[PDB]
Every structure is written in structure tokens, then in C-alpha cells.
Ligand binder design. Structure first.
Ligand SMILES: CCO/N=C\c1ccc(OCC[C@@H](C)CCn2ccn(-c3ccncc3)c2=O)cc1
Ligand SMILES: CCO/N=C\c1ccc(OCC[C@@H](C)CCn2ccn(-c3ccncc3)c2=O)cc1
Lengths: 260, 235, 17, 235, 235, 60, 17, 60, 17, 17, 17
């Protein structure tokens, strides 16, 4: 019953195992084309880059409203997978989002783990689609949500950042319709861990990763955590991402984008 | 089971074709007003709201295209002299082709660009376009940038880009002009391009947009109250 | 009862469903 | 060379047809398709997805974050209904903005046994029993437990599992019902009642919460595609 | 026997198609008079008397439908300026679809609703509709109510209904507008929708109506003397 | 591609014809028929029914 | 002498008697 | 003699089509072809030719 | 799927590609 | 040389000689 | 490649060469 989840060298087992939901029912695989014209072999670090990368820990409180990351943005800072992304031209990767959040039997509250392919976001100002590159990619710390929409009016200092609303999910859809994406619901009553396996979904067969972001992980508090009697309480939420079957091609010089 | 599910297949879900745009065209001398001797239209789907929200259920899609042109005309003066029948030239232009700049340029000679000479009064013209996506699918809702401002750039105004735009000029333009000459009277004409998809195969569904659109992007500005008011325990 | 179907064009994408 | 005759119905552009049309770009090479994951072959596999409904629509909290959760407490009455809504999947405001609703807006007729799901997101220690019922139309609306337990109902528990499943069957006089608020073809009623009081031990919060889902089984079908009302454009 | 009975079969008894309605359409500025920029028509058979009494021999029936549109036009001023040819848009609307409210709304974009762009001067348009009854037959002469006023209602104005009406809005509406712009002159046009049944199979015959009709119901008000005067023993 | 010729009699809407016509609502699913009692297959089984005539037509 | 009959449409209800 | 119907898309001169057309000069005798050297069968054998690029583009 | 091709004219040069 | 004859109508009296 | 020839008329002199 207990999941022995080992991809690569590291290993996340568990004291209690719950589920494993594969997105769209297709396990990640290599390029399987017998009539392909390039039959020469690219770089496939398939057993040398599958470490369970762990992002930074956010402190989930009562009035906090959500978090959102981008992939493969959340690996550019750390890991040798970050070095195999700046040097090469293009690649493909399959992800294992494994969100765990442990707490006692006396807490409550419901979470929601999402995985939106091509997760766009809304701007804030009246200038349409006007967003710089530094604010376009939070990296490893991730962005947050907001409760009500509060745009910008200052025309001298451009903010050029996102400001999504949580029950509009950034895109402009209702929250109650968001479950048609692949998802998994951390119900704190029964289980404490969750996992999602994501395959590579893109219009191309293979794409650059600097100027593109495939998946966006959105975490939404479905019911806020209430303790017995108090009003301020902090439990953590920790997200783990590992690539699977990743491969790259087309070496070039090192490219370092600015981050203001 | 005897319940024919085939009425709501994907080929039947996009079987009805809708409107995408309205393009003006006039015929007079070039005055100090807006010279409406010919009008260009940026080819996109996101210019109406019947079809944008109907296509944006789906992340990736590939499908062949079918167009339809409808031409109406009017007058501007009460007891106008009775003018003749007209010939409208819808000329397609891919990216890289030279943009026409007046009523009669050398680029209007349709040297290789495919065009349709249309006769007013007859049936609506009815042409078909195959799949012209350069990738394996069209890309609804692209995420990233076209360019990345690097560290060792000249300044910040060169490496800047636009959020969520694969191409500066998406898939070319149309061009509409009257073949006939200028007249002392003028005939205002409108053109309603229709659009019907065929052979549709989609992937990765996403929930539909509900707050109204605001420009070509994905953002929003107004009408932030999508639901109404209704009592909880009351039916 | 079936009907008669002929793709009248050498192009593939100019057919019907 | 052949004695043709114009049948009545020429030169009309019907918006729903499958005639031929000439190809604008001949001799073209199509980019071959690849295996994109998540291939939606048919529209009826979107209404078969577990989706959340919004329930609470008071003046204070409509169009806010908290309009999806339903507060059930310890100090609540043992003789009052918790939540009630008529089963009109495209005209009632507590279902029209669900993915099950947002497909049936595009249709006039529908059929099939849709299944509900609820999820109690409370503490581990608190237990209780909740009775959810169905009432076929033609009667008075159910108000209390004495007149609601007669129809099809499920005594749903909280201790062992934390998720109900209610396959609401297909009991209809007509074959296909409509998707509008019409009194002749009405769906029914849905009511939830406390079977017992929520037993909660001390040092545990009193305001538990409950979500609400909706789905559809494999016997689900629509017909007569139409255009919808939820989008708008005042331009 | 050599008497061909097949001239009076059911497919030949409804083979002749008749008229059902007359719909106006105008083209001017919206004045303080009746704004006839577009006219809606409730789809029913009981708007003429050739076809109502010909269908109401029979209690239950199912049959496929075929329509035909005929368009004529006129002028309103003696030495009017010679206006151009016109394009009429007949747009079908099922129930639940949004009712258009002006000359150019977003719902006129025919996003999914099937419509016909018609060109004046050409042949009459000629479309076919399959069987759209939700039961196993259409129901001529429904008896009961749509709603029943219960004992424990709020009052008597809520549970009240209308005698002999299955649906408030029977089977949708039509919508007709001119595509062309407003003009200083105006062109009054009339549209005569025709209707021809096919594939007719009926049940349970009933005697035909003989006193003249009075509204959409089955009642009567005037002309209560159906027979003439003639001597008994006199030929 | 074919030498057609307009025969005399084009573009006329005859009220009694059996030509083809395009379908406005394609791909549609027809509700299947059931066995309703009293299936009149032909109009000549209505005149074959025992019916009453009116006879006396005085002014009163 | 019979005649030639072809249902030219994939729809069923768009035929003739 | 045949129930035709004008499909949408008649009387339009599309610049890219392969319909038929009548012959203006019938019964004509074509001069037979000979073996001219250098028969380009396809456009892609012109980009496969070794050609010079210009590089230096100063003002002078 | 192939299509139907008939050269409708006795002339040779009045065909299509 | 004969020619091609098809009575295109189910009616009998709508033919030609 | 030959073509398709049908004399569509019962008259003889209304053909083509
Ligand atoms: C012979 C002459 O005239 N004919 C016409 C013609 C017309 C249009 C043509 O190209 C086609 C267009 C089309 C496929 C469009 C659509 N489409 C679908 C998604 N997008 C797109 C993507 C990202 N940004 C904006 C929209 C987009 O532009 C080609 C030829
Ligand atoms: C593509 C666009 O335009 N086309 C047309 C269209 C037109 C009509 C359509 O629906 C059909 C109608 C019809 C079956 C009508 C008739 N009918 C027969 C009996 N009744 C009815 C019943 C009870 N009350 C009133 C009348 C009734 O309404 C559908 C599509």
C-alpha cells in the first residue's frame, strides 16, 4: 500500500500513501519514431538529473489566498538541470509535482493542486499585455494571488507586474470550472500528501524552455484553515518537482537573462 | 441504448459558421478625412465574441478553414444618379508580401498572391484554405515571450517584447478595394467575412471565459460580477 | 439507404465531413 | 450539353452546410500530425468531468472567494434544510455557470442520469450523518425531513468515508427535456438535511465546511446545437 | 379494380405547401413611431386558416418540415433615388437563445445559430428541418396544464397557469433584418414564409373545425350559424 | 467542367414539388417512433366511417 | 419505366417522397 | 432534365483554380517537343546551386 | 481517397493539371 | 448512334416524346 | 487520353463535330 516512489537517485516514501493521478492517462516517454530522419542520439540525462528538487517553503496562514509557479521556471536557479537549460537550444521534459502538507488530526481546511497547460495570466494596468520579463517569471519563490482586483493608476512609474484574482484564477474563468484540468485535492481530514505526473504537452514535438513555460502549478485554498479557538496559525506547504525523461539538443554559448 | 451521440461530435460542434469581422470600403476622392479607398484587416479569430469563446475551450487544435464573403452597399444622397454594378477585389496577403499603400499600386497586380475577383449581385463567394500552421497545431493561449532581454544587452528598450505573442503579424492580412473608378457620387459598402471550421481535432480542454474580454489578450478590465443574487435555502 | 459521395477536387482539404 | 434546371434554393448562403468549395492554395503540403496527449474526440467527455458547483449566493459573499463553500455548524437547527436547488441544468443560477451548465447552454435538448458528489472538508474527529434526497416534480417543494425522505435519498455518512455518490436516475415523461426555465418540463428538487447533529469534541472548530460537485454518467446526450447567452459585447 | 388510390395518400394529402405568415421589415431611422428595423415571428402553424384546419383533423402526428422564403419590396416616394440590391438575413433562434434587441447586437453574429443570408432578386430559398419534437410525436390539441396550483402555495397568482399550453415559447422564433445600412429613403419589404410537410404519419382522427377560429386556442366567439336554410321535403 | 444549359423553368418556386433541399440542422438524432394506436395510413379510411347527416333544416 | 433516384445528402430527412 | 442547385460560390473568378475552359482555337496541331539541354523539372534545383553572397556593405 | 477526373473537351490543351 | 435517356421524375406524364 | 462524349438529344443534326 505504501508507495515506494523512486525516480532517479532520491526517494520519497511515506508513512501513509494516498494516490497517484497521471495527467491524461499517458505515461511520459522518449521520442518513438522509427521513420525519423535524425536517428543520432541527443543528450538524455535520464538517470543523472532526476533528483527531487524541493522549492522554497511558504507559510500558509488564515487570510493568505494562493500561490502559483511556472515550469520550467522554478528550476532555473538551482540544480544541474538549470545548467542543461541555459546552454542548450531546446528540450522536452515530464514532471512529477508532489505537493505535501502535513498537519494534525485537529486542523481542517481543504487545498487544491492544479496543473494548467499554457497557463496565461492577466495584467494589471490599462496597457494591454505590457509585462516585463523579470515580473513574468517568479522563479523559485513563486507569486501570490489577491482577493479583489486593484489595478494601477500611476502613469509615471510603470508597475508591469501581474495581479490575478483568486476566484477568477488569473485567466478569467470561474473557480468551480477549474477541475477539468488534471488536479488532486489535498483534503486535510484524511491524507496529507499528493502527487501528479505530467507529460510533455506542446504544439511542437520539442521546444525551447527559456522563452516558453509549459505548466503552471496553482494552489488554491478551498476552505481556510481554522484551529480550535485561535486566529493566527501557520502550517507549511512544500512543493517538489522532478523532471522525467528529459533531453536537450543544440548547444550554444551561455545565455543569462536578467532578473532586474 | 438508441441515443445517437453523433449530433454533438467535434465536427458537428464547429459545423455552424459565424461572423468574424466587418470591413468598410468607400469610393470617392482622397479628401482631408479618412481615406477609405481600401481597408486592410488583420486576420484573427478574436475580433468577435461568438467564436472566440467557442474556440477557447481548447488549448491546442488543428483544423482546416473555410471562408465566405458577403457584400452589401448603400448610397449617401437622396436623388442620386443611378450607378452601375461594382466589382470587389478581395486580395489575400501572406506575411513578407509588400503592403499596398494606395488605390492603384504595382502590388495590386496579383503577380503571385491568390485573390478573388468578386461580382456584386451574384452568390456569396465560398473558398477553402487548408491547414497553414507551421507547428503541428495552432496554439491558442501562448504563454511565453518572443524575445528575452539578456544581461549584456545595449539597453532595456531593445530586448523588450510583448507578453503572449508568437508572431508580430499573425498569418497575414486581407485587402479589399473597388476595381471601378472614382465617381462624383459615393457608394459606401460593407463586407462581412464569415468563417466555418472543418476537420477539427482538438486537445487539452480548459474552462471557458466568463468575464467579458478586453483587447486581444487574456486580461480583463470591467464587469467583475459574473453571478447574480439568489437566496440560499429558497428555491 | 446510403448516398453518393464524390470528392470532386484533387485537393484533400476542400472536401466535406 | 445537358438539360439542367435551377431547383428552388439556389444562390443562398446557408450557415450550416457541407457543400464543396474550390481550394485557394493548391498543391499544398500538410504538416503531419503528432501524438498530443489528451485527445478529446467528442464533446460529451467534458460534461463527464467532476466539476464544482457554486452554492451560497447571499448579498454579502456573491462573486467572492467564499461562494463555493457551504457552512454547516453545531448550533444549526435539526429541522431546517441546509441547501436547496431545483434541477434545471441551464437556467437555474446555481448550475448555469458550471461546466455541466456551460455545455448545456449551447444546446436545447438534453438527457441522461447526472451524478452528484459532495466532499466534507472538516476535522478528523467530528462525525455526523447527512441525508440528501431527490424529489421528482409535480409536488410541493420539500421543506423538512418528514416530507422529503419519501423520494430517492441517500443516508450519507461522515465517519468512514468523506465522499457521497448519488446517481440521480432518469425519470421523465418526455424523452428529451429542455434547457430553459419552462414549467412544463421541470427537473425536480434537491434537498439536504441533518440526519443527526454534528458531534464535535471540545478543542475543535465549530464551523465546518462542505463543498459541492456535479458530474454526468455515460448515458448523457444532447442535440440541436445553438448559441449561448453568458457572453456579452456592448460595442 | 384499376382505381389508383395512391393519389390521396397521406404523403400526397400534405404534399401541397401553403402560407403560414407575413412579416414586415423596413429600413429608416428609429423614429417615435413603431421601430420596424427587424421583426420577430413566433413559430406556429395556427396563424393562417388553410393549414390549421388541414392539420387539425389529426390528434397526434410526426412529420419533417420544409420551409420556403419569398421576398418582395416596394418604395414610399414617387421620384425616389434608385437604390441598390439588398441582402436579407433570416436567422433562426431556438428557445433559450438570447433575444436580439436592436439592429446590430452581438447576438446577430450567428455564433452558432444557423441562419441564411438571402440575396434579393434570385430564386426563393428552400431549406429543410428534420423532426424536432421532444416526445414521440407533435401534440395537436394538448389538454392539461403546465403547472398545478397546490394547496400550500404562497398565493393564487403563482400557481396559476394557462389552459392548453405545453410550453410558454413554442419551438423558438424567427428573426429578419436588412444587412444594408440606413438610407434617407426607405424600402418597405414583406416576407411570406411558406411551409410544406413531408414524411407525414398521423394518428387518431378527429372531426374538423367548422365555426371560425378565435385566437390560438380552441374556443370561439362569433358566427355561430354554420348551416344554411333549405326546405325539408323540397329538393 | 461540364457543358450545362438552363432549361426553361428555372428559378420558379412551384408549390407542389419533390426536389431536394439542404438540411438546416445537420448530424441530428431523430427520436425513434413508438406504437401509437389508431394509425391512419391513408385518407380513404375516414370516408369509410359511419357518420351522421343533418336532415331537417327549417327556419325554426 | 422507372426513373433514377439518388439521395444526394448524407442527411436522411432532406430527401423527397 | 436534372434538378441542379447553385452551390454557394458561383460566378467568382478565383485566381488559383484548375477548372475547365473552352478552347479558343480548336483542331490545332501542336509542334512536337525536342530535347533541349538543361531541363529544370522543379524549382528546388535552383536553390541547390552554388551561388555567391555579398558581404561587405560599407558606405563607400 | 482519389477523385473523379474527366477531360470534358476533345481539345488536349484545355485540360487542367 | 443512340443517345442517353433518363426520365428524371417519378411522375409519368412529365416526360418527353 | 480520350474524353467523354454523349449526344444528349434525340435529334441527329444537333450534335457537334
Ligand atoms: C485566395 C485568397 O483569399 N483567401 C484567403 C485566405 C485567407 C486566410 C488564410 O489564412 C488563414 C487563417 C487562419 C488559419 C487563422 C487563424 N487562427 C487560429 C488561431 N490564430 C491566432 C493565433 C495567435 N494569435 C492570434 C490568432 C489564428 O490566427 C489564408 C488564405
Ligand atoms: C437555419 C435557419 O433557419 N431555419 C429554420 C428552422 C425553422 C423552424 C424550425 O422548427 C420547426 C418547427 C415546427 C416543427 C413547427 C411546428 N408545430 C407543429 C405543432 N406545433 C405547435 C404546438 C403546440 N402549440 C403551438 C404549435 C408547432 O409549433 C427549425 C428550424
Amino acid at each position: 500500500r505504501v508507495l515506494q516512489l523512486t525516480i532517479g537517485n532520491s526517494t520519497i516514501t511515506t508513512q501513509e500513501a494516498a494516490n497517484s493521478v497521471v495527467a491524461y492517462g499517458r505515461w511520459p516517454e522518449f521520442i518513438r519514431d522509427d521513420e525519423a530522419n535524425p536517428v543520432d542520439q541527443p543528450t538524455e540525462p535520464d538517470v543523472a538529473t532526476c533528483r527531487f528538487y524541493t522549492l522554497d517553503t511558504v507559510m500558509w496562514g488564515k487570510e493568505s489566498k494562493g500561490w502559483w509557479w511556472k515550469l520550467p521556471d522554478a528550476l532555473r536557479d538551482m540544480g544541474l538541470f538549470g545548467q542543461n537549460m541555459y546552454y542548450h537550444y531546446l528540450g522536452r521534459s515530464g514532471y512529477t509535482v508532489h505537493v505535501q502538507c502535513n498537519a494534525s488530526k485537529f486542523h481542517q481546511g481543504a487545498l487544491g493542486v492544479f496543473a494548467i497547460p499554457e497557463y496565461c495570466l492577466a495584467g494589471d494596468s490599462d496597457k494591454q499585455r505590457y509585462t516585463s520579463y523579470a515580473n513574468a517569471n517568479p522563479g523559485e519563490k513563486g507569486g501570490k494571488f489577491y482577493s479583489q482586483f486593484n489595478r494601477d493608476t500611476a502613469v509615471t512609474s510603470p508597475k508591469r507586474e501581474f495581479c490575478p484574482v483568486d476566484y477568477l484564477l488569473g485567466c478569467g474563468v470561474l473557480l468551480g470550472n477549474a477541475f477539468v484540468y488534471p488536479h488532486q485535492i489535498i483534503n486535510l481530514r484524511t491524507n496529507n500528501s499528493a502527487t501528479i505526473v505530467l507529460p510533455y504537452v506542446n504544439a511542437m514535438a520539442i521546444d525551447s524552455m527559456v522563452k516558453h513555460n509549459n505548466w503552471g502549478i496553482a494552489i488554491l485554498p478551498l476552505s481556510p484553515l481554522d484551529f480550535a479557538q485561535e486566529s493566527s496559525v501557520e502550517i507549511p506547504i512544500t512543493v517538489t518537482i522532478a523532471p522525467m525523461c528529459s533531453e536537450f539538443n543544440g548547444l550554444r554559448n551561455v545565455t543569462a537573462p536578467k532578473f532586474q | 441504448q438508441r441515443r445517437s451521440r453523433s449530433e454533438s461530435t467535434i465536427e458537428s460542434f464547429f459545423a455552424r459558421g459565424a461572423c468574424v469581422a466587418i470591413i468598410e470600403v468607400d469610393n470617392e476622392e482622397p479628401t482631408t478625412r479618412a481615406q477609405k479607398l481600401f481597408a486592410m484587416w488583420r486576420i484573427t479569430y478574436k475580433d468577435t465574441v461568438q467564436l472566440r469563446r467557442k474556440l477557447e475551450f481548447f488549448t491546442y487544435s488543428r483544423f482546416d478553414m473555410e471562408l465566405t464573403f458577403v457584400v452589401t452597399a448603400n448610397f449617401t444622397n437622396t436623388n442620386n444618379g443611378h450607378a452601375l454594378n461594382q466589382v470587389y477585389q478581395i486580395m489575400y496577403i501572406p506575411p513578407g508580401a509588400p503592403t499596398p499603400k494606395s488605390w492603384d499600386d504595382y502590388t495590386w497586380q496579383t503577380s503571385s498572391n491568390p485573390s478573388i475577383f468578386y461580382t456584386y449581385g451574384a452568390a456569396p463567394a465560398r473558398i477553402s484554405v487548408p491547414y497553414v500552421g507551421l507547428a503541428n497545431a495552432y496554439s491558442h493561449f501562448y504563454d511565453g515571450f518572443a524575445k528575452v532581454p539578456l544581461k549584456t544587452d545595449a539597453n532595456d528598450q531593445i530586448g523588450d517584447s510583448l507578453y503572449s505573442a508568437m508572431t508580430v503579424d499573425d498569418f497575414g492580412v486581407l485587402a479589399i478595394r473597388v476595381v471601378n473608378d472614382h465617381n462624383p457620387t459615393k457608394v459606401t459598402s460593407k463586407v462581412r467575412i464569415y468563417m466555418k471550421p472543418k476537420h477539427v481535432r482538438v486537445w487539452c480542454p480548459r474552462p471557458p471565459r466568463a468575464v467579458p474580454y478586453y483587447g486581444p489578450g487574456v486580461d480583463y478590465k470591467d464587469n467583475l460580477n459574473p453571478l447574480s443574487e439568489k437566496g440560499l435555502t429558497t428555491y | 439507404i446510403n448516398y453518393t459521395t464524390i470528392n470532386y477536387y484533387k485537393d484533400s482539404a476542400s472536401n466535406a465531413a | 450539353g445537358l438539360p439542367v434546371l435551377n431547383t428552388p434554393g439556389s444562390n443562398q448562403y446557408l450557415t450550416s452546410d457541407n457543400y464543396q468549395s474550390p481550394c485557394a492554395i493548391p498543391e499544398f503540403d500538410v504538416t503531419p500530425p503528432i501524438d498530443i496527449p489528451g485527445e478529446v474526440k467528442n464533446m460529451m467527455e467534458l460534461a463527464e468531468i467532476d466539476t464544482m458547483i457554486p452554492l451560497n449566493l447571499e448579498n454579502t459573499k456573491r462573486n467572492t472567494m467564499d461562494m463555493y463553500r457551504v457552512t454547516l455548524s453545531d448550533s444549526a437547527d435539526l429541522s431546517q434544510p441546509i441547501l436547496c436547488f431545483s434541477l434545471s441544468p441551464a437556467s437555474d443560477p446555481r448550475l448555469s455557470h458550471t461546466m455541466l451548465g456551460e455545455v448545456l447552454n449551447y444546446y436545447t435538448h438534453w438527457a441522461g442520469s447526472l451524478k452528484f458528489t459532495f466532499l466534507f472538508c472538516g476535522s478528523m474527529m467530528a462525525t455526523g450523518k447527512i441525508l440528501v434526497a431527490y424529489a421528482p416534480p409535480g409536488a410541493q417543494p420539500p421543506t423538512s425531513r418528514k416530507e422529503a425522505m419519501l423520494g430517492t435519498h441517500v443516508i450519507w455518512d461522515l465517519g468512514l468515508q468523506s465522499s457521497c455518490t448519488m446517481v440521480v436516475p432518469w425519470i421523465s415523461n418526455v424523452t428529451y427535456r429542455q434547457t430553459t426555465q419552462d414549467s412544463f418540463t421541470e427537473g425536480g428538487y434537491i434537498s439536504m438535511f441533518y440526519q443527526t447533529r454534528i458531534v464535535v469534541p471540545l478543542s475543535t472548530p465549530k464551523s465546518m465546511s462542505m463543498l459541492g460537485f456535479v458530474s454526468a454518467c455515460n448515458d448523457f446526450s444532447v442535440r440541436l446545437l445553438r448559441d449561448t447567452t453568458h457572453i456579452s459585447q456592448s460595442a
